[PDB]
Amino acid sequence: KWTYFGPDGENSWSKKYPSCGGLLQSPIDLHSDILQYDASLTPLEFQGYNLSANKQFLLTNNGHSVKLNLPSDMHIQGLQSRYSATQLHLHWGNPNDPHGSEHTVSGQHFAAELHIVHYNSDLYPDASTASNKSEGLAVLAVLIEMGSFNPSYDKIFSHLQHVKYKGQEAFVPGFNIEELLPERTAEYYRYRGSLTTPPCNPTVLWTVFRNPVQISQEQLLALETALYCTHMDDPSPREMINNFRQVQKFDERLVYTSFSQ
Amino acid sequence: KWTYFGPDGENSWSKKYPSCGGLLQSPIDLHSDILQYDASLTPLEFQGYNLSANKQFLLTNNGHSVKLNLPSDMHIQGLQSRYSATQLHLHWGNPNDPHGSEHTVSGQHFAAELHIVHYNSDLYPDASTASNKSEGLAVLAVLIEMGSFNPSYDKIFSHLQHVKYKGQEAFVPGFNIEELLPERTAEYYRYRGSLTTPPCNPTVLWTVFRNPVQISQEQLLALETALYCTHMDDPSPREMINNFRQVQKFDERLVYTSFSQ
Numbered sequence: 001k002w003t004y005f006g007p008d009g010e011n012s013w014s015k016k017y018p019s020c021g022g023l024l025q026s027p028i029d030l031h032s033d034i035l036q037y038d039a040s041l042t043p044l045e046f047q048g049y050n051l052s053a054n055k056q057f058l059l060t061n062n063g064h065s066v067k068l069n070l071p072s073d074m075h076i077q078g079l080q081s082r083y084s085a086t087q088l089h090l091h092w093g094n095p096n097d098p099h100g101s102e103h104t105v106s107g108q109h110f111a112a113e114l115h116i117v118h119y120n121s122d123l124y125p126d127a128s129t130a131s132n133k134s135e136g137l138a139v140l141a142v143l144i145e146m147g148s149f150n151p152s153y154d155k156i157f158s159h160l161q162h163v164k165y166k167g168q169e170a171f172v173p174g175f176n177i178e179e180l181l182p183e184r185t186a187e188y189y190r191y192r193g194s195l196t197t198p199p200c201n202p203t204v205l206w207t208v209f210r211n212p213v214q215i216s217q218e219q220l221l222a223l224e225t226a227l228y229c230t231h232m233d234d235p236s237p238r239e240m241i242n243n244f245r246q247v248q249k250f251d252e253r254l255v256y257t258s259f260s261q
Numbered sequence: 262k263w264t265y266f267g268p269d270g271e272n273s274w275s276k277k278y279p280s281c282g283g284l285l286q287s288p289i290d291l292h293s294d295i296l297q298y299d300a301s302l303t304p305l306e307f308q309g310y311n312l313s314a315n316k317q318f319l320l321t322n323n324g325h326s327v328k329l330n331l332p333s334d335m336h337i338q339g340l341q342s343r344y345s346a347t348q349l350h351l352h353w354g355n356p357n358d359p360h361g362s363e364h365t366v367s368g369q370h371f372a373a374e375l376h377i378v379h380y381n382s383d384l385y386p387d388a389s390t391a392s393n394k395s396e397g398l399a400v401l402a403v404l405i406e407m408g409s410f411n412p413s414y415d416k417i418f419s420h421l422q423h424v425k426y427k428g429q430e431a432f433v434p435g436f437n438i439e440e441l442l443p444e445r446t447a448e449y450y451r452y453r454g455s456l457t458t459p460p461c462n463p464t465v466l467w468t469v470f471r472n473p474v475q476i477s478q479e480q481l482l483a484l485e486t487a488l489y490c491t492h493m494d495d496p497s498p499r500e501m502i503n504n505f506r507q508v509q510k511f512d513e514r515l516v517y518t519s520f521s522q
């Protein structure tokens with residue numbers, strides 16, 4: 001019921017999902033005029049990220065992204081409540097315009113962006129219930145650029161051929177999810193925002209790491225070309241590309257940084 | 262009562278104005294991956310732009326911008342039909358953040374943007390009729406940077422305290438409208454797009470000049486503080502600020518440039 005293009009694209013999400021036209025929408029451009037150092041922003045700790053290599057985690061193509069389900073023993077420590085993981089997924093562009101991050105920095109897109117979605121398990125029983133509630137969600141965002149081959153991202157990307165079409169599903173052996181995070185995770189942007197997809201609820205505490213990670217040219221091309229947003233038997237297949245929302249206006253507000261330097 | 266902020270803002274325009282959720286939407290970010298030189302983009306000529314100083318032209322606050330009405334003897338030569346002027350208007354930011362252009366270049370906003378709207382007068386008897394027809398309109402867009410005081414722009418801005426409220430009108434003596442255009446008008450970006458306001462009809466041939474003009478901080482501050490979207494008697498006044506649309510997905514379009522480097 002929604003897409004990133006045509007008449008069911010982002011300008012039309014607010015018809016069926018009214019929060020997509022409401023306050024606190026994400027993503028936003030992170031630029032110097034709206035940044036403010038806040039010494040209250042201490043390092044997060046990533047607990048239970050080293051997933052059992054004896055467990056399997058479900059990877060899906062849900063027609064909007066590729067998603068890896070995560071166990072609720074994985075969590076962020078350092079916020080006021082515990083936030084437990086529920087899933088990760090990615091956003092990207094296309095080979096002719098390979099600049100499909102959702103957040104931008106000083107007006108510039110990165111190649112792609114990883115989101116690790118968490119919910120407030122101290123207040124709410126599960127992610128779905130949390131998603132529309134106060135303090136409900138926290139997302140860690142990693143900016144991705146082209147560079148050296150990244151073995152850790154390949155622990156996900158090596159499975160993409162098995163989830164080519166909408167509805168398909170693959171099992172990924174546990175690995176250390178912290179390997180997907182960049183250098184100096186102490187350095188981050190922090191703001192209160194929204195889901196960047198429908199239903200766009202304004203219930204997300206965003207942490208965007210300052211430093212990007214690298215993946216190779218081949219890995220980025222794989223991500224951009226491996227998936228379709230249609231079911232296997234659709235007689236009009238569509239490639240899953242450009243699955244990012246445009247930046248939203250952000251006026252009279254700050255993004256807090258854990259770094260001044 | 263569409264606006265640029267709050268529940269009637271741009272993510273909701275498609276609820277009432279379906280073409281705002283359609284294809285070919287403007288404005289866009291002008292960046293290298295989608296640019297392509299086209300040697301057939303020869304220079305436009307601006308005919309009848311030197312308006313007599315002994316004549317006067319109506320300036321109006323239309324609740325969304327300030328607009329100057331232009332005579333149909335003013336036209337562009339060099340497109341495949343004659344396009345005659347109908348009006349010019351601006352888009353801008355706000356006093357604390359003067360970054361309100363509609364088009365961006367390599368991710369960066371300019372301070373403001375001037376649009377000079379023309380319609381195909383060879384085919385249509387007026388701009389409203391043209392506005393519904395493919396390439397019915399042609400707009401010239403000038404990017405505006407904070408810089409030196411600009412006496413030519415001030416021929417418009419010096420009247421702003423007289424059109425402070427929606428529906429108000431003032432007369433502006435004629436001046437040479439070509440003085441609002443930048444240097445090297447032969448260098449431009451060209452693309453097929455839309456109105457950037459409701460009803461967002463995809464019927465505009467866009468020409469965005471490569472080079473910006475400058476107006477001063479004081480001229481921007483006057484533009485950003487003088488006007489209201491509301492009538493003079495409205496008990497809930499709204500300042501006319503931040504009257505620009507976010508950039509839109511490309512939808513596979515390229516932008517053609519008359520300059521190669």
Ligand SMILES: NS(=O)(=O)c1cc(C(=O)NCCO)c(SC2CCCCC2)cc1Cl
Nearest residue numbers: 064115117127128131137139194195196197
């Ligand atoms: N791009 S984002 O803002 O990180 C984000 C995306 C999704 C999400 O998976 N969207 C696609 C299909 O609806 C979800 S799904 C959401 C979480 C599970 C409980 C309710 C659905 C949540 C977030 Cl924060």
Ligand SMILES: NS(=O)(=O)c1cc(C(=O)NCCO)c(SC2CCCCC2)cc1Cl
Nearest residue numbers: 325376378388389392398400455456457458
């Ligand atoms: N920002 S833009 O794309 O240059 C543009 C703006 C308007 C415009 O004046 N919009 C305010 C709505 O009240 C119009 S008004 C349109 C002018 C032709 C006659 C039909 C009204 C046309 C354009 Cl192209």
Ligand SMILES: [Zn+2]
Nearest residue numbers: 089091115196
């Ligand atoms: Zn996401």
Ligand SMILES: [Zn+2]
Nearest residue numbers: 350352376457
């Ligand atoms: Zn305009």
